[PDB]
Amino acid sequence: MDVEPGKFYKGVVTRIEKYGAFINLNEQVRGLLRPRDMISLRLENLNVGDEIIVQAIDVRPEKREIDFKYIPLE
Protein backbone atom coordinates (compact mmCIF):
# COMPACT_ATOMS: atom_id res chain seq x y z
CA MET A 1 0.00 0.00 0.00
CA ASP A 2 1.17 3.53 -0.90
CA VAL A 3 0.14 6.70 0.98
CA GLU A 4 -1.02 10.01 -0.55
CA PRO A 5 -0.90 13.39 1.32
CA GLY A 6 -4.52 14.22 2.26
CA LYS A 7 -5.99 10.68 2.13
CA PHE A 8 -7.62 8.67 4.95
CA TYR A 9 -5.86 5.63 6.53
CA LYS A 10 -5.88 3.45 9.68
CA GLY A 11 -2.58 2.82 11.48
CA VAL A 12 -1.15 1.02 14.53
CA VAL A 13 0.87 2.69 17.33
CA THR A 14 4.44 1.33 17.68
CA ARG A 15 5.74 3.43 20.62
CA ILE A 16 4.67 6.52 22.61
CA GLU A 17 7.14 9.44 22.43
CA LYS A 18 7.07 12.60 24.60
CA TYR A 19 6.48 14.59 21.37
CA GLY A 20 4.08 12.23 19.54
CA ALA A 21 3.40 8.59 18.60
CA PHE A 22 5.10 6.68 15.75
CA ILE A 23 2.48 4.77 13.71
CA ASN A 24 2.86 2.13 10.95
CA LEU A 25 0.49 2.20 7.94
CA ASN A 26 2.28 -0.39 5.79
CA GLU A 27 5.31 -2.76 5.71
CA GLN A 28 7.70 0.08 4.67
CA VAL A 29 5.44 3.04 5.65
CA ARG A 30 5.69 4.72 9.09
CA GLY A 31 5.03 8.26 10.38
CA LEU A 32 4.56 10.49 13.45
CA LEU A 33 1.27 11.50 15.13
CA ARG A 34 1.58 14.80 17.08
CA PRO A 35 -0.65 15.80 20.09
CA ARG A 36 -1.89 19.19 18.78
CA ASP A 37 -3.10 17.37 15.65
CA MET A 38 -5.19 15.10 17.92
CA ILE A 39 -8.89 15.76 18.72
CA SER A 40 -10.57 13.16 21.00
CA LEU A 41 -7.45 11.03 21.75
CA ARG A 42 -4.40 12.28 23.72
CA LEU A 43 -0.87 10.74 23.61
CA GLU A 44 -1.28 10.23 27.36
CA ASN A 45 -4.07 7.69 26.67
CA LEU A 46 -2.54 5.92 23.63
CA ASN A 47 -0.90 2.47 23.96
CA VAL A 48 1.39 0.30 21.82
CA GLY A 49 -0.84 -1.77 19.51
CA ASP A 50 -3.88 0.57 19.33
CA GLU A 51 -5.46 1.00 15.86
CA ILE A 52 -5.99 4.75 15.30
CA ILE A 53 -7.83 6.21 12.27
CA VAL A 54 -5.91 9.24 10.92
CA GLN A 55 -5.57 11.40 7.80
CA ALA A 56 -2.17 11.87 6.11
CA ILE A 57 -0.91 15.49 6.25
CA ASP A 58 2.45 15.41 4.40
CA VAL A 59 4.10 12.43 2.65
CA ARG A 60 7.80 13.26 2.20
CA PRO A 61 9.70 10.71 -0.02
CA GLU A 62 13.06 12.34 0.83
CA LYS A 63 12.25 11.76 4.54
CA ARG A 64 10.34 8.44 4.14
CA GLU A 65 8.15 9.59 7.09
CA ILE A 66 4.61 11.05 7.24
CA ASP A 67 2.67 13.47 9.50
CA PHE A 68 -0.65 12.10 10.82
CA LYS A 69 -3.77 14.06 11.83
CA TYR A 70 -6.60 12.80 14.07
CA ILE A 71 -10.15 13.42 12.80
CA PRO A 72 -13.64 13.01 14.39
CA LEU A 73 -14.55 11.25 11.10
CA GLU A 74 -13.67 7.73 12.34
mmCIF file with all atom_site columns, C-alpha atoms in Angstrom:
data_model
loop_
_atom_site.group_PDB
_atom_site.id
_atom_site.type_symbol
_atom_site.label_atom_id
_atom_site.label_alt_id
_atom_site.label_comp_id
_atom_site.label_asym_id
_atom_site.label_entity_id
_atom_site.label_seq_id
_atom_site.pdbx_PDB_ins_code
_atom_site.Cartn_x
_atom_site.Cartn_y
_atom_site.Cartn_z
_atom_site.occupancy
_atom_site.B_iso_or_equiv
_atom_site.pdbx_formal_charge
_atom_site.auth_seq_id
_atom_site.auth_comp_id
_atom_site.auth_asym_id
_atom_site.auth_atom_id
_atom_site.pdbx_PDB_model_num
ATOM 1  C CA . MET A 1 1  ? 0.000   0.000  0.000  1.00 0.00 ? 1  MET A CA 1
ATOM 2  C CA . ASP A 1 2  ? 1.175   3.528  -0.904 1.00 0.00 ? 2  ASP A CA 1
ATOM 3  C CA . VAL A 1 3  ? 0.140   6.702  0.981  1.00 0.00 ? 3  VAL A CA 1
ATOM 4  C CA . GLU A 1 4  ? -1.023  10.011 -0.549 1.00 0.00 ? 4  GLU A CA 1
ATOM 5  C CA . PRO A 1 5  ? -0.904  13.389 1.321  1.00 0.00 ? 5  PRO A CA 1
ATOM 6  C CA . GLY A 1 6  ? -4.517  14.216 2.256  1.00 0.00 ? 6  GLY A CA 1
ATOM 7  C CA . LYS A 1 7  ? -5.995  10.677 2.131  1.00 0.00 ? 7  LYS A CA 1
ATOM 8  C CA . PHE A 1 8  ? -7.623  8.666  4.955  1.00 0.00 ? 8  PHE A CA 1
ATOM 9  C CA . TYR A 1 9  ? -5.862  5.626  6.525  1.00 0.00 ? 9  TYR A CA 1
ATOM 10 C CA . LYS A 1 10 ? -5.876  3.450  9.679  1.00 0.00 ? 10 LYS A CA 1
ATOM 11 C CA . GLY A 1 11 ? -2.576  2.816  11.481 1.00 0.00 ? 11 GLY A CA 1
ATOM 12 C CA . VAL A 1 12 ? -1.148  1.023  14.530 1.00 0.00 ? 12 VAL A CA 1
ATOM 13 C CA . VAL A 1 13 ? 0.870   2.695  17.333 1.00 0.00 ? 13 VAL A CA 1
ATOM 14 C CA . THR A 1 14 ? 4.444   1.326  17.683 1.00 0.00 ? 14 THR A CA 1
ATOM 15 C CA . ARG A 1 15 ? 5.741   3.428  20.615 1.00 0.00 ? 15 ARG A CA 1
ATOM 16 C CA . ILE A 1 16 ? 4.669   6.516  22.613 1.00 0.00 ? 16 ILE A CA 1
ATOM 17 C CA . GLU A 1 17 ? 7.138   9.442  22.431 1.00 0.00 ? 17 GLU A CA 1
ATOM 18 C CA . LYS A 1 18 ? 7.065   12.601 24.598 1.00 0.00 ? 18 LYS A CA 1
ATOM 19 C CA . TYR A 1 19 ? 6.475   14.589 21.368 1.00 0.00 ? 19 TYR A CA 1
ATOM 20 C CA . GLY A 1 20 ? 4.079   12.234 19.536 1.00 0.00 ? 20 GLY A CA 1
ATOM 21 C CA . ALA A 1 21 ? 3.403   8.590  18.602 1.00 0.00 ? 21 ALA A CA 1
ATOM 22 C CA . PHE A 1 22 ? 5.101   6.676  15.751 1.00 0.00 ? 22 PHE A CA 1
ATOM 23 C CA . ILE A 1 23 ? 2.484   4.774  13.709 1.00 0.00 ? 23 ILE A CA 1
ATOM 24 C CA . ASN A 1 24 ? 2.861   2.128  10.952 1.00 0.00 ? 24 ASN A CA 1
ATOM 25 C CA . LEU A 1 25 ? 0.487   2.204  7.945  1.00 0.00 ? 25 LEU A CA 1
ATOM 26 C CA . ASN A 1 26 ? 2.281   -0.388 5.792  1.00 0.00 ? 26 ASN A CA 1
ATOM 27 C CA . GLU A 1 27 ? 5.313   -2.762 5.714  1.00 0.00 ? 27 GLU A CA 1
ATOM 28 C CA . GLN A 1 28 ? 7.704   0.080  4.668  1.00 0.00 ? 28 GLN A CA 1
ATOM 29 C CA . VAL A 1 29 ? 5.445   3.036  5.652  1.00 0.00 ? 29 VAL A CA 1
ATOM 30 C CA . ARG A 1 30 ? 5.690   4.717  9.095  1.00 0.00 ? 30 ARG A CA 1
ATOM 31 C CA . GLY A 1 31 ? 5.035   8.261  10.379 1.00 0.00 ? 31 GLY A CA 1
ATOM 32 C CA . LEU A 1 32 ? 4.561   10.492 13.448 1.00 0.00 ? 32 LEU A CA 1
ATOM 33 C CA . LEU A 1 33 ? 1.274   11.502 15.135 1.00 0.00 ? 33 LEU A CA 1
ATOM 34 C CA . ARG A 1 34 ? 1.583   14.804 17.075 1.00 0.00 ? 34 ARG A CA 1
ATOM 35 C CA . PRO A 1 35 ? -0.650  15.796 20.095 1.00 0.00 ? 35 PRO A CA 1
ATOM 36 C CA . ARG A 1 36 ? -1.888  19.190 18.785 1.00 0.00 ? 36 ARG A CA 1
ATOM 37 C CA . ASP A 1 37 ? -3.096  17.371 15.650 1.00 0.00 ? 37 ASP A CA 1
ATOM 38 C CA . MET A 1 38 ? -5.193  15.104 17.921 1.00 0.00 ? 38 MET A CA 1
ATOM 39 C CA . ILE A 1 39 ? -8.885  15.762 18.724 1.00 0.00 ? 39 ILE A CA 1
ATOM 40 C CA . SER A 1 40 ? -10.566 13.155 21.005 1.00 0.00 ? 40 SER A CA 1
ATOM 41 C CA . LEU A 1 41 ? -7.449  11.035 21.748 1.00 0.00 ? 41 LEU A CA 1
ATOM 42 C CA . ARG A 1 42 ? -4.399  12.278 23.723 1.00 0.00 ? 42 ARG A CA 1
ATOM 43 C CA . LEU A 1 43 ? -0.866  10.740 23.607 1.00 0.00 ? 43 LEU A CA 1
ATOM 44 C CA . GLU A 1 44 ? -1.281  10.230 27.364 1.00 0.00 ? 44 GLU A CA 1
ATOM 45 C CA . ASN A 1 45 ? -4.068  7.693  26.670 1.00 0.00 ? 45 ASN A CA 1
ATOM 46 C CA . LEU A 1 46 ? -2.539  5.917  23.634 1.00 0.00 ? 46 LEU A CA 1
ATOM 47 C CA . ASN A 1 47 ? -0.897  2.469  23.957 1.00 0.00 ? 47 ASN A CA 1
ATOM 48 C CA . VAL A 1 48 ? 1.388   0.298  21.816 1.00 0.00 ? 48 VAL A CA 1
ATOM 49 C CA . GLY A 1 49 ? -0.843  -1.773 19.508 1.00 0.00 ? 49 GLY A CA 1
ATOM 50 C CA . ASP A 1 50 ? -3.881  0.569  19.332 1.00 0.00 ? 50 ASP A CA 1
ATOM 51 C CA . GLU A 1 51 ? -5.463  0.998  15.864 1.00 0.00 ? 51 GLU A CA 1
ATOM 52 C CA . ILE A 1 52 ? -5.988  4.749  15.301 1.00 0.00 ? 52 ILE A CA 1
ATOM 53 C CA . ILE A 1 53 ? -7.831  6.208  12.274 1.00 0.00 ? 53 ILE A CA 1
ATOM 54 C CA . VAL A 1 54 ? -5.913  9.235  10.920 1.00 0.00 ? 54 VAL A CA 1
ATOM 55 C CA . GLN A 1 55 ? -5.568  11.402 7.801  1.00 0.00 ? 55 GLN A CA 1
ATOM 56 C CA . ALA A 1 56 ? -2.173  11.868 6.106  1.00 0.00 ? 56 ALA A CA 1
ATOM 57 C CA . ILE A 1 57 ? -0.909  15.487 6.249  1.00 0.00 ? 57 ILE A CA 1
ATOM 58 C CA . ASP A 1 58 ? 2.450   15.409 4.399  1.00 0.00 ? 58 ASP A CA 1
ATOM 59 C CA . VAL A 1 59 ? 4.097   12.432 2.654  1.00 0.00 ? 59 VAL A CA 1
ATOM 60 C CA . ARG A 1 60 ? 7.803   13.260 2.199  1.00 0.00 ? 60 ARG A CA 1
ATOM 61 C CA . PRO A 1 61 ? 9.702   10.707 -0.015 1.00 0.00 ? 61 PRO A CA 1
ATOM 62 C CA . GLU A 1 62 ? 13.060  12.344 0.829  1.00 0.00 ? 62 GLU A CA 1
ATOM 63 C CA . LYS A 1 63 ? 12.254  11.761 4.537  1.00 0.00 ? 63 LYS A CA 1
ATOM 64 C CA . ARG A 1 64 ? 10.340  8.441  4.137  1.00 0.00 ? 64 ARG A CA 1
ATOM 65 C CA . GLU A 1 65 ? 8.150   9.595  7.093  1.00 0.00 ? 65 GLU A CA 1
ATOM 66 C CA . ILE A 1 66 ? 4.605   11.048 7.240  1.00 0.00 ? 66 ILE A CA 1
ATOM 67 C CA . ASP A 1 67 ? 2.670   13.472 9.498  1.00 0.00 ? 67 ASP A CA 1
ATOM 68 C CA . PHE A 1 68 ? -0.648  12.103 10.823 1.00 0.00 ? 68 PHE A CA 1
ATOM 69 C CA . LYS A 1 69 ? -3.771  14.058 11.834 1.00 0.00 ? 69 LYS A CA 1
ATOM 70 C CA . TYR A 1 70 ? -6.604  12.797 14.072 1.00 0.00 ? 70 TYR A CA 1
ATOM 71 C CA . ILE A 1 71 ? -10.147 13.417 12.805 1.00 0.00 ? 71 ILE A CA 1
ATOM 72 C CA . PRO A 1 72 ? -13.644 13.008 14.388 1.00 0.00 ? 72 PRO A CA 1
ATOM 73 C CA . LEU A 1 73 ? -14.548 11.253 11.102 1.00 0.00 ? 73 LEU A CA 1
ATOM 74 C CA . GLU A 1 74 ? -13.671 7.735  12.337 1.00 0.00 ? 74 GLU A CA 1
#
